[PDB]
Each structure stands twice: as C-alpha cells, then as structure tokens.
mmCIF file of C-alpha atoms and ligand atoms in Angstrom:
data_model
loop_
_atom_site.group_PDB
_atom_site.id
_atom_site.type_symbol
_atom_site.label_atom_id
_atom_site.label_comp_id
_atom_site.label_asym_id
_atom_site.label_seq_id
_atom_site.Cartn_x
_atom_site.Cartn_y
_atom_site.Cartn_z
ATOM 1 C CA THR A 2 101.244 40.799 15.116
ATOM 2 C CA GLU A 3 102.049 42.824 12.009
ATOM 3 C CA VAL A 4 100.778 45.845 13.951
ATOM 4 C CA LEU A 5 103.512 45.108 16.506
ATOM 5 C CA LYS A 6 106.134 45.222 13.744
ATOM 6 C CA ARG A 7 105.142 48.060 11.394
ATOM 7 C CA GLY A 8 102.575 49.995 13.428
ATOM 8 C CA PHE A 9 103.337 53.335 15.049
ATOM 9 C CA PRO A 10 101.957 55.039 18.198
ATOM 10 C CA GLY A 11 98.429 56.281 17.653
ATOM 11 C CA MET A 12 97.694 54.272 14.507
ATOM 12 C CA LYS A 13 93.944 54.175 13.938
ATOM 13 C CA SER A 14 93.604 51.645 11.112
ATOM 14 C CA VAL A 15 95.539 48.601 9.950
ATOM 15 C CA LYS A 16 95.575 50.205 6.473
ATOM 16 C CA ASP A 17 97.877 52.980 7.720
ATOM 17 C CA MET A 18 100.956 50.760 8.147
ATOM 18 C CA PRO A 19 104.010 52.184 6.326
ATOM 19 C CA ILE A 20 105.842 50.396 3.517
ATOM 20 C CA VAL A 21 109.459 51.309 2.695
ATOM 21 C CA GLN A 22 110.943 48.971 0.072
ATOM 22 C CA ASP A 23 113.377 49.029 -2.828
ATOM 23 C CA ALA A 24 111.597 51.141 -5.436
ATOM 24 C CA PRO A 25 112.363 52.968 -8.678
ATOM 25 C CA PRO A 26 112.661 56.767 -8.386
ATOM 26 C CA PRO A 27 109.647 58.941 -9.271
ATOM 27 C CA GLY A 28 109.367 59.079 -13.036
ATOM 28 C CA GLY A 29 111.353 55.865 -13.355
ATOM 29 C CA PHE A 30 114.883 55.420 -14.525
ATOM 30 C CA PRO A 31 115.929 57.124 -17.785
ATOM 31 C CA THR A 32 115.973 55.157 -21.023
ATOM 32 C CA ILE A 33 118.998 53.150 -22.156
ATOM 33 C CA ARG A 34 120.491 51.964 -25.421
ATOM 34 C CA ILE A 35 119.609 48.389 -26.393
ATOM 35 C CA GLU A 36 120.521 47.789 -30.030
ATOM 36 C CA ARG A 37 123.900 47.706 -31.768
ATOM 37 C CA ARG A 38 125.460 51.012 -32.826
ATOM 38 C CA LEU A 39 128.104 51.404 -35.527
ATOM 39 C CA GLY A 43 135.848 52.823 -43.500
ATOM 40 C CA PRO A 44 137.600 54.818 -46.216
ATOM 41 C CA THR A 45 136.839 54.100 -49.852
ATOM 42 C CA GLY A 46 138.949 51.400 -51.505
ATOM 43 C CA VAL A 47 139.857 53.878 -54.248
ATOM 44 C CA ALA A 48 141.502 56.095 -51.612
ATOM 45 C CA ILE A 49 143.347 53.163 -50.003
ATOM 46 C CA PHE A 50 144.630 51.948 -53.365
ATOM 47 C CA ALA A 51 145.667 55.494 -54.329
ATOM 48 C CA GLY A 52 147.699 55.957 -51.142
ATOM 49 C CA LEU A 53 149.301 52.533 -51.568
ATOM 50 C CA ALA A 54 150.146 53.305 -55.202
ATOM 51 C CA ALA A 55 151.710 56.624 -54.184
ATOM 52 C CA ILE A 56 153.927 54.987 -51.538
ATOM 53 C CA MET A 57 154.966 52.160 -53.878
ATOM 54 C CA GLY A 58 155.690 54.599 -56.718
ATOM 55 C CA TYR A 59 157.955 56.636 -54.451
ATOM 56 C CA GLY A 60 159.693 53.399 -53.457
ATOM 57 C CA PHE A 61 160.230 52.386 -57.085
ATOM 58 C CA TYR A 62 161.644 55.827 -57.923
ATOM 59 C CA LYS A 63 164.101 55.536 -55.026
ATOM 60 C CA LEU A 64 165.046 52.038 -56.230
ATOM 61 C CA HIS A 65 165.809 53.393 -59.718
ATOM 62 C CA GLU A 66 167.913 56.247 -58.295
ATOM 63 C CA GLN A 67 169.957 53.998 -55.999
ATOM 64 C CA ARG A 68 170.487 51.525 -58.864
ATOM 65 C CA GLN A 69 172.005 54.262 -61.029
ATOM 66 C CA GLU A 70 174.215 55.442 -58.147
ATOM 67 C CA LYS A 71 175.433 51.875 -57.562
ATOM 68 C CA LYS B 243 81.146 22.554 37.257
ATOM 69 C CA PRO B 244 78.152 21.820 34.993
ATOM 70 C CA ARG B 245 77.511 18.473 33.397
ATOM 71 C CA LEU B 246 76.939 17.994 29.692
ATOM 72 C CA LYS B 247 73.395 17.356 28.525
ATOM 73 C CA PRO B 248 72.429 14.590 27.696
ATOM 74 C CA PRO B 249 71.850 13.147 30.328
ATOM 75 C CA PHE B 250 69.138 15.423 31.675
ATOM 76 C CA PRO B 251 68.495 16.041 35.396
ATOM 77 C CA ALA B 252 64.988 14.565 35.212
ATOM 78 C CA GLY B 253 66.588 11.343 33.992
ATOM 79 C CA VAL B 254 69.875 11.262 35.941
ATOM 80 C CA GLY B 255 70.263 14.044 38.488
ATOM 81 C CA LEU B 256 71.213 14.271 42.155
ATOM 82 C CA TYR B 257 72.809 10.996 43.360
ATOM 83 C CA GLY B 258 71.901 9.431 40.012
ATOM 84 C CA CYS B 259 68.187 9.919 40.679
ATOM 85 C CA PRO B 260 65.420 11.842 38.849
ATOM 86 C CA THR B 261 65.582 15.497 39.838
ATOM 87 C CA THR B 262 63.947 18.810 38.922
ATOM 88 C CA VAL B 263 65.607 22.167 39.600
ATOM 89 C CA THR B 264 63.228 25.137 39.806
ATOM 90 C CA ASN B 265 63.536 28.796 40.785
ATOM 91 C CA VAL B 266 62.280 30.227 44.097
ATOM 92 C CA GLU B 267 59.814 32.575 42.394
ATOM 93 C CA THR B 268 58.562 29.739 40.173
ATOM 94 C CA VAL B 269 57.956 27.561 43.241
ATOM 95 C CA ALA B 270 56.405 30.257 45.446
ATOM 96 C CA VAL B 271 53.606 31.359 43.085
ATOM 97 C CA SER B 272 52.274 27.812 42.640
ATOM 98 C CA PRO B 273 49.978 27.593 45.754
ATOM 99 C CA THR B 274 48.299 30.897 44.875
ATOM 100 C CA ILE B 275 47.833 29.649 41.310
ATOM 101 C CA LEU B 276 46.288 26.399 42.559
ATOM 102 C CA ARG B 277 43.946 28.201 44.982
ATOM 103 C CA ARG B 278 42.938 31.156 42.770
ATOM 104 C CA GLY B 279 42.858 29.180 39.522
ATOM 105 C CA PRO B 280 44.812 28.971 36.282
ATOM 106 C CA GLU B 281 42.254 31.158 34.492
ATOM 107 C CA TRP B 282 42.943 33.937 36.992
ATOM 108 C CA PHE B 283 46.695 33.679 36.393
ATOM 109 C CA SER B 284 46.457 33.546 32.594
ATOM 110 C CA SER B 285 44.240 36.663 32.482
ATOM 111 C CA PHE B 286 47.366 38.812 32.866
ATOM 112 C CA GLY B 287 49.759 39.561 30.029
ATOM 113 C CA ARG B 288 49.728 38.520 26.394
ATOM 114 C CA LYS B 289 49.142 35.053 24.977
ATOM 115 C CA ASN B 290 51.950 32.584 25.838
ATOM 116 C CA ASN B 291 53.219 35.240 28.286
ATOM 117 C CA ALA B 292 50.823 34.768 31.157
ATOM 118 C CA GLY B 293 50.816 36.025 34.697
ATOM 119 C CA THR B 294 52.516 38.448 37.046
ATOM 120 C CA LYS B 295 56.201 39.083 37.664
ATOM 121 C CA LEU B 296 58.547 40.622 40.207
ATOM 122 C CA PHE B 297 60.646 43.403 38.676
ATOM 123 C CA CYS B 298 63.834 44.831 40.178
ATOM 124 C CA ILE B 299 64.703 48.334 38.968
ATOM 125 C CA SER B 300 68.212 49.529 39.772
ATOM 126 C CA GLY B 301 70.710 52.083 38.559
ATOM 127 C CA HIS B 302 70.037 55.691 37.560
ATOM 128 C CA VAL B 303 66.446 55.758 38.808
ATOM 129 C CA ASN B 304 64.906 58.182 41.326
ATOM 130 C CA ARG B 305 63.171 55.403 43.313
ATOM 131 C CA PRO B 306 64.885 51.997 42.955
ATOM 132 C CA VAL B 307 62.450 49.273 43.869
ATOM 133 C CA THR B 308 61.540 45.604 43.924
ATOM 134 C CA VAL B 309 57.900 45.679 42.824
ATOM 135 C CA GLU B 310 55.379 43.137 41.554
ATOM 136 C CA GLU B 311 53.546 44.000 38.349
ATOM 137 C CA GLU B 312 51.587 42.448 35.503
ATOM 138 C CA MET B 313 53.667 41.095 32.642
ATOM 139 C CA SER B 314 53.705 42.791 29.196
ATOM 140 C CA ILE B 315 53.884 46.234 30.845
ATOM 141 C CA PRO B 316 55.970 48.788 28.885
ATOM 142 C CA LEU B 317 59.400 49.738 30.218
ATOM 143 C CA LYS B 318 58.487 53.425 30.252
ATOM 144 C CA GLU B 319 55.326 52.748 32.250
ATOM 145 C CA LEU B 320 57.201 50.378 34.596
ATOM 146 C CA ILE B 321 59.914 52.971 35.259
ATOM 147 C CA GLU B 322 57.995 56.271 35.329
ATOM 148 C CA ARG B 323 55.409 54.858 37.688
ATOM 149 C CA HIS B 324 56.554 52.548 40.531
ATOM 150 C CA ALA B 325 60.100 53.922 40.325
ATOM 151 C CA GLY B 326 60.012 57.697 39.861
ATOM 152 C CA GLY B 327 61.475 57.648 36.357
ATOM 153 C CA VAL B 328 64.971 58.168 35.020
ATOM 154 C CA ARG B 329 67.320 60.434 36.994
ATOM 155 C CA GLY B 330 67.128 63.756 35.166
ATOM 156 C CA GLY B 331 64.066 62.961 33.059
ATOM 157 C CA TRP B 332 63.320 60.360 30.403
ATOM 158 C CA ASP B 333 65.292 62.360 27.837
ATOM 159 C CA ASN B 334 68.415 61.793 29.967
ATOM 160 C CA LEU B 335 68.179 58.045 29.314
ATOM 161 C CA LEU B 336 71.075 56.379 27.506
ATOM 162 C CA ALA B 337 70.585 52.599 27.719
ATOM 163 C CA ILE B 338 68.720 49.926 29.684
ATOM 164 C CA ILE B 339 69.533 46.268 30.333
ATOM 165 C CA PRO B 340 66.066 44.711 30.780
ATOM 166 C CA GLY B 341 66.812 41.254 32.156
ATOM 167 C CA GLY B 342 69.741 41.142 34.547
ATOM 168 C CA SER B 343 73.220 41.102 33.059
ATOM 169 C CA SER B 344 73.231 38.165 30.625
ATOM 170 C CA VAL B 345 70.949 39.852 28.062
ATOM 171 C CA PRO B 346 71.976 42.578 25.572
ATOM 172 C CA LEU B 347 71.270 46.207 26.322
ATOM 173 C CA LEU B 348 68.750 48.363 24.458
ATOM 174 C CA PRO B 349 69.067 52.032 23.454
ATOM 175 C CA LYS B 350 66.516 54.791 24.045
ATOM 176 C CA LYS B 351 64.647 54.289 20.750
ATOM 177 C CA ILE B 352 63.840 50.614 21.358
ATOM 178 C CA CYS B 353 63.008 51.177 25.043
ATOM 179 C CA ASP B 354 60.322 53.768 24.296
ATOM 180 C CA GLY B 355 57.589 51.374 23.225
ATOM 181 C CA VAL B 356 58.876 47.889 23.990
ATOM 182 C CA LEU B 357 56.898 45.791 26.446
ATOM 183 C CA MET B 358 58.595 43.973 29.307
ATOM 184 C CA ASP B 359 57.656 40.568 27.992
ATOM 185 C CA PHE B 360 59.233 37.263 26.944
ATOM 186 C CA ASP B 361 58.044 37.451 23.323
ATOM 187 C CA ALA B 362 58.697 41.190 23.027
ATOM 188 C CA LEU B 363 62.235 41.677 24.305
ATOM 189 C CA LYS B 364 63.372 38.697 22.216
ATOM 190 C CA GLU B 365 62.156 40.327 18.992
ATOM 191 C CA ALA B 366 63.976 43.495 20.094
ATOM 192 C CA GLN B 367 67.243 41.457 20.121
ATOM 193 C CA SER B 368 67.285 41.063 23.918
ATOM 194 C CA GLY B 369 65.590 38.910 26.555
ATOM 195 C CA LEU B 370 63.466 39.132 29.670
ATOM 196 C CA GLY B 371 65.772 36.881 31.719
ATOM 197 C CA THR B 372 65.151 37.453 35.419
ATOM 198 C CA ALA B 373 63.345 40.793 34.739
ATOM 199 C CA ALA B 374 66.044 42.795 36.517
ATOM 200 C CA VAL B 375 66.146 46.298 35.044
ATOM 201 C CA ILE B 376 69.372 48.330 35.070
ATOM 202 C CA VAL B 377 69.140 51.944 33.914
ATOM 203 C CA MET B 378 72.019 54.138 32.735
ATOM 204 C CA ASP B 379 71.863 57.849 31.931
ATOM 205 C CA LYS B 380 73.840 60.137 29.624
ATOM 206 C CA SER B 381 76.637 60.592 32.187
ATOM 207 C CA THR B 382 77.447 56.861 31.912
ATOM 208 C CA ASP B 383 80.487 55.501 30.102
ATOM 209 C CA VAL B 384 78.654 52.509 28.649
ATOM 210 C CA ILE B 385 81.905 50.897 27.439
ATOM 211 C CA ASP B 386 83.186 51.039 31.029
ATOM 212 C CA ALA B 387 79.957 49.448 32.312
ATOM 213 C CA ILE B 388 80.090 46.580 29.819
ATOM 214 C CA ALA B 389 83.823 46.270 30.580
ATOM 215 C CA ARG B 390 83.010 45.685 34.253
ATOM 216 C CA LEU B 391 80.425 43.137 33.113
ATOM 217 C CA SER B 392 83.179 41.424 31.099
ATOM 218 C CA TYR B 393 85.342 41.443 34.233
ATOM 219 C CA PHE B 394 82.482 39.780 36.129
ATOM 220 C CA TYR B 395 82.145 37.027 33.543
ATOM 221 C CA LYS B 396 85.911 36.481 33.536
ATOM 222 C CA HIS B 397 85.844 36.237 37.343
ATOM 223 C CA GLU B 398 82.883 33.841 37.421
ATOM 224 C CA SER B 399 84.022 31.361 34.748
ATOM 225 C CA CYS B 400 84.395 27.884 36.217
ATOM 226 C CA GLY B 401 87.235 27.038 33.833
ATOM 227 C CA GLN B 402 85.984 23.625 32.731
ATOM 228 C CA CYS B 403 85.759 24.138 28.966
ATOM 229 C CA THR B 404 88.194 25.777 26.554
ATOM 230 C CA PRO B 405 86.180 28.655 24.959
ATOM 231 C CA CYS B 406 84.743 30.133 28.169
ATOM 232 C CA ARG B 407 87.914 29.675 30.258
ATOM 233 C CA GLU B 408 90.287 31.108 27.701
ATOM 234 C CA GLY B 409 88.070 33.642 25.942
ATOM 235 C CA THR B 410 86.409 35.507 28.820
ATOM 236 C CA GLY B 411 89.820 36.867 29.790
ATOM 237 C CA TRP B 412 90.469 37.750 26.143
ATOM 238 C CA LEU B 413 87.142 39.607 25.940
ATOM 239 C CA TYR B 414 88.031 41.474 29.133
ATOM 240 C CA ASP B 415 91.472 42.460 27.780
ATOM 241 C CA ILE B 416 89.994 43.712 24.493
ATOM 242 C CA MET B 417 87.260 45.649 26.323
ATOM 243 C CA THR B 418 89.830 47.195 28.681
ATOM 244 C CA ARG B 419 91.803 48.380 25.652
ATOM 245 C CA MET B 420 88.597 49.681 24.011
ATOM 246 C CA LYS B 421 87.731 51.766 27.086
ATOM 247 C CA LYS B 422 90.937 53.788 26.665
ATOM 248 C CA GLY B 423 90.645 53.789 22.867
ATOM 249 C CA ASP B 424 93.969 51.946 22.496
ATOM 250 C CA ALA B 425 92.815 49.750 19.639
ATOM 251 C CA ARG B 426 92.184 49.570 15.904
ATOM 252 C CA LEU B 427 88.898 49.946 14.071
ATOM 253 C CA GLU B 428 88.966 46.390 12.704
ATOM 254 C CA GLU B 429 89.474 45.083 16.233
ATOM 255 C CA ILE B 430 85.761 45.818 16.759
ATOM 256 C CA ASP B 431 84.888 43.301 14.042
ATOM 257 C CA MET B 432 87.472 40.988 15.609
ATOM 258 C CA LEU B 433 85.671 41.426 18.955
ATOM 259 C CA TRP B 434 82.351 40.460 17.354
ATOM 260 C CA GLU B 435 84.034 37.419 15.779
ATOM 261 C CA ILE B 436 85.486 36.327 19.139
ATOM 262 C CA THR B 437 82.058 36.582 20.802
ATOM 263 C CA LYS B 438 80.646 34.470 17.967
ATOM 264 C CA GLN B 439 83.448 31.956 18.591
ATOM 265 C CA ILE B 440 82.569 31.612 22.306
ATOM 266 C CA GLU B 441 78.776 31.612 21.921
ATOM 267 C CA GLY B 442 77.114 28.271 21.232
ATOM 268 C CA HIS B 443 80.427 26.438 21.540
ATOM 269 C CA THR B 444 80.661 25.827 25.312
ATOM 270 C CA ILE B 445 79.313 23.317 27.822
ATOM 271 C CA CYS B 446 76.833 25.580 29.624
ATOM 272 C CA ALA B 447 75.183 28.929 28.952
ATOM 273 C CA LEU B 448 77.644 31.161 30.810
ATOM 274 C CA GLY B 449 79.660 31.450 27.591
ATOM 275 C CA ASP B 450 76.601 32.760 25.754
ATOM 276 C CA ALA B 451 75.940 35.027 28.744
ATOM 277 C CA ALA B 452 79.504 36.333 28.382
ATOM 278 C CA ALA B 453 79.188 36.957 24.644
ATOM 279 C CA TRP B 454 75.761 38.638 24.697
ATOM 280 C CA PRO B 455 76.479 42.014 26.462
ATOM 281 C CA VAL B 456 79.418 42.717 24.145
ATOM 282 C CA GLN B 457 77.235 41.927 21.120
ATOM 283 C CA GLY B 458 74.617 44.412 22.328
ATOM 284 C CA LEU B 459 77.243 47.072 23.037
ATOM 285 C CA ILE B 460 78.744 46.699 19.547
ATOM 286 C CA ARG B 461 75.338 46.617 17.831
ATOM 287 C CA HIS B 462 73.859 49.675 19.517
ATOM 288 C CA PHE B 463 76.937 51.798 20.256
ATOM 289 C CA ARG B 464 79.523 51.007 17.565
ATOM 290 C CA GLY B 465 79.749 54.746 16.843
ATOM 291 C CA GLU B 466 80.754 55.436 20.447
ATOM 292 C CA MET B 467 83.493 52.782 20.262
ATOM 293 C CA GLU B 468 84.782 54.211 16.968
ATOM 294 C CA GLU B 469 84.804 57.739 18.398
ATOM 295 C CA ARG B 470 86.648 56.486 21.493
ATOM 296 C CA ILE B 471 89.290 54.945 19.227
ATOM 297 C CA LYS B 472 89.579 58.023 16.984
ATOM 298 C CA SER B 473 89.772 60.615 19.768
ATOM 299 C CA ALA B 474 92.386 58.670 21.751
ATOM 300 C CA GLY B 475 94.857 59.572 18.994
ATOM 301 C CA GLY B 476 94.358 63.193 19.988
ATOM 302 C CA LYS B 477 96.404 62.250 23.070
ATOM 303 C CA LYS B 478 98.594 59.433 21.692
ATOM 304 C CA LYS B 479 99.710 60.676 18.260
ATOM 305 C CA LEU B 480 100.970 63.974 19.701
ATOM 306 C CA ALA B 481 103.836 61.967 21.237
ATOM 307 C CA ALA B 482 104.587 59.916 18.107
ATOM 308 C CA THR B 483 105.493 63.069 16.160
HETATM 309 S S1 SF4 C 1 80.875 27.941 29.757
HETATM 310 FE FE1 SF4 C 1 82.251 28.710 31.400
HETATM 311 S S2 SF4 C 1 81.099 28.270 33.313
HETATM 312 FE FE2 SF4 C 1 80.111 27.015 31.689
HETATM 313 S S3 SF4 C 1 81.174 25.002 31.792
HETATM 314 FE FE3 SF4 C 1 82.304 26.235 30.253
HETATM 315 S S4 SF4 C 1 83.970 27.225 31.450
HETATM 316 FE FE4 SF4 C 1 82.456 26.474 32.972
#
C-alpha cells in the first residue's frame, strides 16, 4: 500500500522508497545570538552642567547691571 | 464439497453408513497379493515401503511411459532405463516433481541419488504421492510451470472454506506477477508467509496441495526468482527515467 504511494516504476526493494520532508540545510543553520548584549562619566556630566549654569549666571549678572 | 473430520467415513459415510474409500490401484493388486502371498509382496522395496508400484513418467523425457517397477528404485535408474532418459542428457535436467503435482519439486542435486520411495522423498522435503514423475529441462521457465500449477489449484478450489477459496487466487496473482518480475524482493517472503497461512488451516488437503509447489519453488529456486525481479528493471526502469 505504501509502495502504491511512494514507490516508483522499477523499484526493486521496499527500502528504496524516497523521503522528501522538511529538513535543515546541509551543515545546519548558522549560529545565533542568545544572551543579552550591552554612559559618560559623572564628572563629565557635572562639568558640562556647571559650564552651562556658569554661563547663565554670568548673563544674569550682566542683564542685572544693564537693568 | 468435503466434510470435516470427525466424523470419519468408516463411522458415518455414504447414506450415513460405514464406508471405505480406496484407490483403483490399491484395490486391483489385492487378489494377486492374496494368491501369491504377503511374503512375496513384501520382498520388494525397503522396510515399511513394501511392494511394486506403477510409475508415470511425463514431460521432457525421450520415452514417456506408464511402467510398473519395484519400489525404492532411484529416480535416475527409473528415468534412464524404462524411459530413455532426460531430453538432451542427464546434465540437461533442471527439476523433477516426483509425485504428481501436489508435492514439492526437487532440483538436480537431490534427484541424483534419491530413491523413489515413501520414506525417502519425504526426507528430501517432498513426497511420493501418486508416483507420477514430471521432468523439466534447462529450457523450462520453472516459475511459469509452477504458475500454471497455481492456476490449476485456483481453478479446482471448491470454494467452501475461507483460506483455500480466497488465497488460491491470491497465490496465482502473486505468481503471475513474479513470472514477469513485476514484484519486490520482500514479496517472496510474503509469498512464503501466505502459503504458510493457507497450509494446515483449511477443511481438506487441497489447500496444503496448493501451498506445497510454491514452497518447493521458493526453497530450491529463490535465486531464479530474485534474478527475475532484478532483471525486469532492465526493461522497466529505463522508462521511469
Ligand atoms: S481446501 Fe479448498 S477444496 Fe478443500 S474444502 Fe477448502 S475450499 Fe474446498
């Protein structure tokens, strides 16, 4: 019965029946990432903030004298 | 259509009365045995194999013949004398059925030496049967011959019981496919299994007589069947590609 389904003309043995299924490619699939993959120093952040605030305070002093 | 035993014909037979069925040749030799004595009759052949026997030699034989002979005679003696030997010489022999059609065949190696006897063909995996000798030579397709025997047993089934009635046609279909080589290699083992399913499982002995020639063909010529399957793909697989 299975010979009626998968067998081909001139098949000599039942062990010669083809199998074509969903299969990985030869060599398999390539590897993948599994695990988790990953700022500025606080001195640098505080220095930039101090520079901006110092410029602001200088401008405040200048506009106060003009007023 | 045969009855099941028990009852037995000597207990309940024809018209419900005690009855014995005997062969013509069994009946006919009895007056000569009674007149000439039992010691004269038992002086021929081996022990438990006494007396004389009519032999019919047919097939590929130079002088086919119905001839009377002593029992326990060799096949080669019985064929070379009284029948002129095998057509083309003894080396042209392929196979011989020694006991009609219901017994398995024998190849050339067993035949050279075996005695035509009840207790000698049985040990050679055959039987004396009716002592009807059928000779085939090397020009014979032995699968075709046993296929025609399978056709005979399909045609002669009375159809009463399930294994004989359904399986003789199945054996004939499988053998017809095997003759052309349109089969698989494991279908030979399937064929042996189907003969073992028929044999010993029926009402009468025609089922056994239908299984036995195929068993002998498989046993002594499985290589021929395998070669017939393999070489058929030299004319069937050229169209598949
Ligand atoms: S074995 Fe065949 S012939 Fe004998 S009783 Fe069964 S069917 Fe009929």
